[PDB]
Design a protein around this ligand. Structure first.
Ligand code: SF4
Ligand code: SF4
Lengths: 531, 534
């Protein structure tokens, strides 16, 4: 006989485990009514604007408890490495700066993602996407955030939309008369570490699955600013369903799922395999960015039903800029998840002068092995994805490598907007691996001998630095607000201003910490843990 | 100033270009009302059961015009290869059988996927998932389909749910008072060929993108029964959004999108790069399964906005079992897309080695050894049928010290499974499965004296070529997709031999006549895909 079984059966479908604050006076935006014998809710769509504005403001200055607790755990664990503690201490201090509500916790203030669940009898007037987008527009326009969205004018010609729109608006039809939300300000760096695998029954035994996990976790590397929230989804009804689930798992949205399967194919969380993921993460030695135990905060593993011929698998992380906020609108008004406003309660090198010919800097760096902590003082030239592409194009047309690529270390980065009275907006490093295809080319043409970013890099960069006498320095990844507040003293746009954050910048820095990751001798700080 | 721009802006948002039929009398399921000055539609949720039942029945017996036209193009194009025309003719003949409404067009009757868009003022009572699931349940229970969903009792212990549930139910909240739908009966073989790539700005120039397309199309191989509808999505706001878009693009759901971008980042279809995908597909020589021009029916290329640090890319196909149906409920009742009920009108107005399998297996190996890869054979006699779960069970037995069972050494091994048997028929639809999923067993089984001759569809990995060379083995490629005509014409008797508890994935002993295949891998190191899928 027929038995309906929903795939997802959370025991806490409305997230009662989360603490919410009500927006003062917001009961004026709602009215409970009774139509055709059923309870309904009229919602003034301005409530969606107010809510989205607040969610995408608060989320850049505060974190959840389970995120902050992980950084404290890395500081207090006797088994953590010195680098584990240094990175976690820096990120907590960064969070203390961000909680001042001026600088966002990361320069990458993310794609605006809205998961909405509108009850059958929740009546907004239907213009939900417009009103939500206006609230998002307000948050990014009137706060010191960043405009990160790139519009395609044709297949290859692009421009920044200038307002961080469009958002991703996933609005679902569900029972009842409320409106429930998960807002995510998703960094590009962790978005890029969402992976889909197409597997078979041969994966589905303990030995094969553990080897698979070990292999795939290494491909995350340090490129998305660990410690990670690691989410793994085994199965799914389609690739897109597997990937949506792994995103939500990484947001801890499915934490109240059952922990056992049944003959109807319901989804379940697997604590036994979450523990195995954490054991792999810890024993990997990758650590919180620079070697150690704290590759991962925590793990979520969800097992899904599958077509008998199929085994899609999803792997994704939430990065140091762990940014999501639950919310709901009901007959009492607008409620928004309460994040931690006092992160401070969780708190328990070689000097390199850049103000010289770059060959003198290269010579000093050559005296030290990979793993050495350095403090940089002087000028950095800032350039990432589009600027690198433009410069390669110039040289392909016979033009010289620009002077500003040959005088100073190249910082792969872009700033968020500058607060009034401040020298710099949040201004941390971007993922180095995206620039790997340029390094040998630029070095063979006399520049980019020293680069500064975050994340492990491919072997071609190690070979290039050895061939050309180059270096790759790894900044701590994630602490964009304290870097801006403490290290960055002057910021000037050098070239391609139309590129927004991706313009070429000239910045003057003091006490800028980094590690020598790749030297000029073929050595790589990550060669043992991320081989 | 603020300007709202929806990412997707189809010029035909309600699919007026699609022909719909009204379910007779279905206006009795709806009622127009007005509350708070606004027009609303009350919908008896039984309408969802009725609609889902008809959709997931019709779609297994009929195809859209653009799919059938693609097969006719492969028959009539002077540039099509001889194998292109043979494969396309076989698939059209299969569709004519399926149009008899008894046998489904493929044995893999798919995952039931529902994209629903419920208007703000469309009131169903809210139990949409249950009522849709009951209609899907009716369709798979009361027709000659298959129960394809595998429940996980724990991480590794599995069972079939026995009713092709759960469905994928993606119900969206949208303006208005109607209920619009796209139903997809998605085969596992093409679902497995949905790929996500994490790329960068370094990809986004003509030379790199063309090279990328060339490289990735080859990784599709023939594993999902081409000619393909190829969908390529460049960009996206997240991996899951990119993959949903490429799925819908493969269903031709986004055909009316704009063809140019703008400063607000709207999605667009790119006809120039669709033409490039088609050129790449055609010049690949991969062909409609066995070499030629018709690797692809058509292409869809959607360009999406992206975070500046990101460039997700999606690639996906719709296979020969191209199965989707649009539908909507409005004030006039239930409307469902009209598919083509007379596929025979696409067939034109107007050479193989006979292989007797009823000989010792070593005599069959000897005869096959006389011929080069690419030789078309006609098989007559016994096949032993086993795919994913049976292979895993047998390897598990061997790991525990048991011998390879005798029934794995007497006849060629057909990787396949049947749909339910129609009353009075020898077999339900019973076509081949994707061979590549069994690649890890071949060398092991051949080292223990069996599986010397395998029969399935799709190109295989190099380890299979090496095993067949080491052990004097062969891989025969059945045409992929024509499950109904294989069942009606070739498969004469089906008996369950072992592991009856595995259901569809039991070991079967079947007798076949005039079963066509190509020698894909011989016993000499040759592989008919070695040049096109190198
Ligand atoms: S820089 Fe690091 S912390 Fe910030 S969004 Fe990118 S991956 Fe996340
Ligand atoms: S056997 Fe071929 S046609 Fe049938 S569902 Fe699988 S890939 Fe599609």
């Amino acid at each position: 006989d027929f038995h309906f079984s929903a795939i997802f059966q959370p025991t806490d479908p409305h997230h009662h485990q989360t603490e919410f604050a009500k927006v003062e006076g917001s009961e004026k935006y709602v009215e409970e009514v009774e139509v055709f014998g059923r309870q309904a809710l009229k919602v003034n769509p301005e409530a969606l604007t107010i809510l989205a504005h607040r969610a995408f403001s608060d989320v850049h200055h505060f974190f959840r408890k389970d995120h902050l607790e992980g950084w404290r755990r890395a500081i207090e664990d006797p088994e953590a490495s010195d680098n584990d503690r240094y990175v976690a201490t820096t990120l907590l201090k960064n969070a203390c700066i961000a909680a001042g509500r001026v600088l966002p916790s990361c320069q990458d203030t993310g794609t605006a993602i809205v998961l909405g669940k509108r009850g059958e009898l929740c009546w907004t007037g239907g213009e939900d996407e417009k009103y939500l987008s206006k609230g998002i527009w307000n948050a990014y326009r009137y706060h010191n955030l960043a405009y990160s969205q790139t519009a395609a004018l044709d297949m290859f010609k692009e421009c920044n939309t200038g307002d961080n729109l469009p958002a991703q608006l996933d609005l679902l039809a569900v029972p009842g008369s409320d409106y429930e939300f998960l807002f995510i300000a998703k960094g590009g760096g962790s978005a890029n570490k969402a992976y889909l695998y197409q597997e078979t029954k041969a994966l589905l035994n303990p030995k094969s699955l553990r080897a698979f996990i070990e292999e795939k976790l290494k491909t995350l590397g340090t490129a998305a600013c660990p410690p990670y929230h690691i989410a793994l989804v085994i199965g799914g009804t389609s690739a897109e369903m597997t990937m949506k689930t792994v995103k939500l798992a990484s947001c801890r949205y499915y934490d109240s799922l059952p922990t056992t399967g049944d003959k109807y194919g319901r989804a379940f969380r697997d604590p036994e395999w979450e523990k195995i993921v954490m054991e792999v993460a810890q024993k990997s030695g990758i650590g919180a960015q620079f070697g150690g135990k704290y590759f991962a905060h925590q793990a979520r593993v969800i097992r899904l039903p599958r077509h008998g011929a199929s085994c899609p698998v999803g792997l994704a992380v939430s990065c140091s800029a762990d940014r999501q906020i639950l919310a709901h609108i009901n007959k009492s008004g607008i409620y928004i998840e309460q994040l931690e406003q006092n992160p401070a309660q969780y708190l328990p090198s070689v000097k390199v002068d850049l103000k010289r010919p770059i060959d003198k800097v290269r010579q000093q760096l050559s005296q030290y092995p990979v793993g050495t902590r350095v403090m940089l003082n002087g000028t950095l030239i800032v350039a990432r994805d589009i600027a690198h592409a433009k410069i390669k194009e110039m040289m392909d047309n016979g033009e010289p490598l620009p002077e500003y690529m040959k005088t100073s270390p190249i910082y792969y980065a872009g700033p968020a907007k500058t607060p009034e009275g401040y020298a710099s907006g949040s201004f941390g490093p971007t993922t180095a691996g995206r620039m790997d295809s340029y390094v040998d080319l630029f070095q063979s043409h006399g520049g980019s001998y020293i680069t500064l970013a975050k994340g492990n890099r491919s072997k071609q960069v190690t070979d290039a630095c050895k061939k050309h006498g180059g270096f790759y320095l790894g900044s701590i990844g994630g602490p964009a607000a304290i870097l801006a507040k403490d290290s960055i003293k002057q910021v000037t746009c050098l070239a391609f201003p139309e590129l927004g954050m991706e313009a070429v910048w000239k910045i003057e820095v003091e006490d800028f910490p980094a590690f020598i990751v790749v030297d000029d001798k073929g050595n790589d700080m990550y060669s043992k843990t991320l081989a």
